[PDB]
From a paper:
[name] organizes the rotationally ninefold symmetric cartwheel, an early assembly intermediate of centrioles that participates in establishing their symmetry and diameter. The cartwheel is organized through the homo-oligomerization of the highly conserved centriolar protein [name]. High-resolution crystal structures of zebrafish and C. reinhardtii [name] fragments together with biochemical and biophysical characterizations demonstrated that two dimerization interfaces in [name] mediate this oligomerization: a coiled-coil domain that forms a rod-like parallel dimer; and a globular N-terminal domain that forms a curved head-to-head dimer. [name] is a highly conserved protein that is found in all eukaryotes that have cilia/flagella during some of their life-cycle stages.
Author numbering:
A (entry chain A): 131 to 237, 244 to 314
B (entry chain B): 130 to 238, 244 to 314
The structure:
């Protein structure tokens, strides 16, 4: 299970409680294994909001439903190659040097994420993904994991800070005696 | 002012039906603030958590308006104002290790549990306080998990920020003392 992309990206969002607006969102793309028996290859696309921890949308693209998916979007790429394609596009948008935009529009418990090139005449669509809002179960899991992760990271930070403070304090303490 | 009187981990004798009777570390958290049906009644929150299980969350929201009944039932001789001071002092003593009192948390069987501070003499197990904590629902749990997540992320950032500062501040002090 490898994580191909974790970053924050600026996104044109239509959400009914709010107004149409351009917000930063977290996009996460992890390839792994899953499905009804944990045997089918999978690509996860997860959309999150750094300002709202209860905002969580995911698409679990099962390899067995990829043919239909490939055809509907008229892609010319393996299941193997698809995330590479998607991530490259997102990364370009994230890294700021790109002509493409991201749109996330609600429609509720489903939302569509689109990579769009905007020319003079037309808004050209390069990909469209339907992400499902996650239920309490999956959200709790997400929140838990994040919490555990950042706590763990916070500990590690302090641990290695104490190490370094001491390592250099001894190098200050030896330059002082000499 | 919503003030946090105690956040610490304390060793606790626990009866929980999925597990065996055992002495685990648990997180006790005592925050005084304001709340209730209209957000106007003074409140004391006691929260019990498990560092090993993020889905374990038990809380008592002691409303000042139901404290008289509470005070009588436990036969306390303390204000609502003084009560948490009392409770926290006891817990802190137990946490500090310099204490004759123990903590007991026992579940039912599964959404209520009782937390007791107990002094064990030769003849009797004397009870100094008993609190009933309610397991919290997905709503309150998600809120908890969210807050913790945000907090530790925020803290993790701050740690790194001030680490980079210090590494540089001392590396410059290593970089200057060697040449001089």
């Amino acid at each position: 299970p490898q994580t191909l992309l974790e970053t924050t990206v600026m996104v044109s969002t239509k959400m009914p409680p709010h107004e149409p607006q351009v917000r930063p969102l977290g996009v996460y793309v992890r390839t792994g294994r899953g499905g009804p028996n944990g045997v089918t290859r999978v690509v996860l696309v997860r959309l999150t909001d750094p300002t709202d921890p209860f905002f969580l949308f995911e698409l679990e693209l099962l390899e067995d439903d990829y043919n239909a998916f490939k055809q509907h979007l008229e892609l010319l790429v393996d299941f193997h190659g698809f995330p590479r394609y998607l991530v490259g596009m997102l990364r370009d948008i994230a890294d700021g040097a790109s002509a493409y935009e991201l749109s996330f529009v609600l429609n509720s418990n489903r939302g569509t994420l689109r990579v769009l090139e905007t020319t003079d005449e037309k808004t050209v669509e390069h990909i469209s993904l339907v992400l499902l809002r996650q239920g309490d179960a999956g959200l709790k899991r997400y929140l838990a994991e994040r919490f555990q992760h950042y706590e763990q990271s916070f500990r590690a930070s302090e641990a290695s800070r104490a190490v370094i403070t001491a390592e250099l304090q001894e190098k200050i303490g030896d330059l002082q005696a000499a």
